[PDB]
Amino acid sequence: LSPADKTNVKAAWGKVGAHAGEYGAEALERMFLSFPTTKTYFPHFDLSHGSAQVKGHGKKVADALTNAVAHVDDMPNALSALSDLHAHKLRVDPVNFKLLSHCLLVTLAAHLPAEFTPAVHASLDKFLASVSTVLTSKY
Amino acid sequence: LSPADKTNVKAAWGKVGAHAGEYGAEALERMFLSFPTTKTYFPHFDLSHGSAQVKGHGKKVADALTNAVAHVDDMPNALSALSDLHAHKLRVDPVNFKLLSHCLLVTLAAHLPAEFTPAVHASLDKFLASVSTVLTSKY
Amino acid sequence: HLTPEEKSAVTALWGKVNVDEVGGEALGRLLVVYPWTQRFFESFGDLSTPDAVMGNPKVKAHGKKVLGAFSDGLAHLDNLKGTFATLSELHCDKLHVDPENFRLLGNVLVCVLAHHFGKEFTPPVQAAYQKVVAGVANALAHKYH
Amino acid sequence: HLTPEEKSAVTALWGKVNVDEVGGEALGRLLVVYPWTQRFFESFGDLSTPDAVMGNPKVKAHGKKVLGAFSDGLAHLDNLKGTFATLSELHCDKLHVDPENFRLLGNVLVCVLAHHFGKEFTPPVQAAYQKVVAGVANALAHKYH
């Protein structure tokens, strides 16, 4: 990421703060409804609105993203274990990372109107595409 | 790239040898006919079959790929100048790098039947996707 | 392809949309977020900064035309191919825009609606709009098929 | 949309295709080159190495069925949607395969044809086949639209 993008991502994620988990759970719910093909990766999950399993999983996704923001210059190393899980174990189709990234952007636009400027939108899209590249690196 | 992929790429490119330029020109011709949208990036070019301009440009593409094979562990540095040209100056749509990569694979399959094994096909696809990632890095 | 509930939810929200500003914001954000799209709009003027893009009068005026085509599509959901026939021919044969970019603009429009309506742009409301933008993208890419 | 010349070039080359081996090679290479596709074929057995994939009898047998559907499509180019109606329903509603993978298989098949015919698989011949595989991919993705 470029210095301008790093600064935009750190500033936007700071405003997200303690609500990261909530936003993560909402992004997953938006993905399951808009793109039903993504549901096949979670047969062992309760996928109903306001599910405790979706809330719990949304927190884990958000924690991984918060750790990626803090380690923005060393993302492949910080997310190494997650790459093995998604690519080797779960065999997640790479197109699904784009679908989740889009749903996270929609979630942030709906909750942070003053923060979601065109410049910040561009930086967050670049950050999520970098995260997706690391998670599919084993392919 | 993994050690297995590096070895496959070096062995397949060694067999290509002095015919790299010819294969580069053929890959471009295959791209222009199969995907006519790509022609808009070359209005100043003679795009007819057996064009001297296409032959000359095919040699430049092949030389850049040969340099990438020799600097496989340091690809972002070796291809840095080409990233600025394609992304900042020419504004090449990222989808076009996938279209050219596919046409190069078709060209190699038609000229090297004994060399184009499923394992070598997989390694060459990974190498071309790494080249494409570097050339679109400025986006 | 839309259930009666989904159709009423899309139509209700669309009537609240400020056509004079939503279109300009969607087109402007495509140019900022995906910079390769700027080569098709060189003749629009100054596109050097995000603020110059959003404030460009030709970007705002063109955005109104784009949203007008989307409004036309919502009025003829059963016949999307017929409603976008000449527009498909224009984008393909004259402009040579790769069809992947139609999906990107559709997704950017979804982000702009979420930004303008907040909590009113609920997950079932988004799901119905995703069906609409995918249909519009597919109808625009017909002359390539 | 294929020109009469393009239609005759595709049909002529297809008559030379060894159905018993081209299909197995195209399916096998998809599993090796794009490893995420392997999760849909877990019940096929050992897929751990490229040699195990290419030598798998269930991969070879299934490949013949895939090529059979392509042959059916080439016989009904004017009505691709009708020819792939039930197959579209199967891949979408029962298997939940992302439509992007239909394009990938089409491209792998193009590589396999170039490998089998060499210099006979000329750039105009490839151009006509690219239109066919894109048409087949679009007809298979209809039940999603």
Ligand code: HEM
């Ligand atoms: C932004 C991209 C993503 C991030 C940061 C992310 C992060 C995570 C994390 C942290 C875990 C838990 C790992 C553990 O507890 O050991 C996880 C699990 C998982 N992820 Fe992702 N993930 C992402 C995208 C995806 C996508 C696109 C899919 C598929 C649609 C997916 C499917 C799964 C599944 C199935 C599991 C295992 C759930 C379980 O069995 O408990 N992930 N992910």
Ligand code: HEM
């Ligand atoms: C494998 C990926 C590619 C490689 C290695 C590659 C390599 C090159 C090289 C070495 C040059 C010449 C630079 C110079 O002389 O200073 C060049 C020029 C150029 N490339 Fe690429 N290129 C690739 C993909 C593409 C694609 C996909 C397009 C668009 C469809 C494209 C369009 C151009 C154009 C328009 C020029 C300038 C030609 C001119 O005005 O003379 N390139 N490329």
Ligand code: HEM
């Ligand atoms: C996906 C939804 C899209 C719709 C509904 C759409 C609609 C339109 C409409 C209605 C026009 C006006 C044509 C006229 O007045 O005769 C137009 C023009 C144009 N569109 Fe699109 N468009 C879309 C996507 C795109 C994309 C993704 C690009 C390129 C990135 C693009 C580039 C253009 C250009 C360059 C023009 C001509 C502008 C000029 O004459 O200066 N469009 N579009």
Ligand code: HEM
């Ligand atoms: C794009 C061209 C494709 C064609 C023409 C095609 C055709 C077929 C055909 C004819 C069948 C047999 C159905 C039956 O006998 O009832 C089949 C089954 C299937 N296809 Fe495809 N297919 C294509 C792509 C894909 C892709 C890309 C995937 C996944 C990556 C896929 C996964 C499957 C699976 C899992 C089955 C069921 C196998 C079983 O019952 O064990 N197909 N396909």
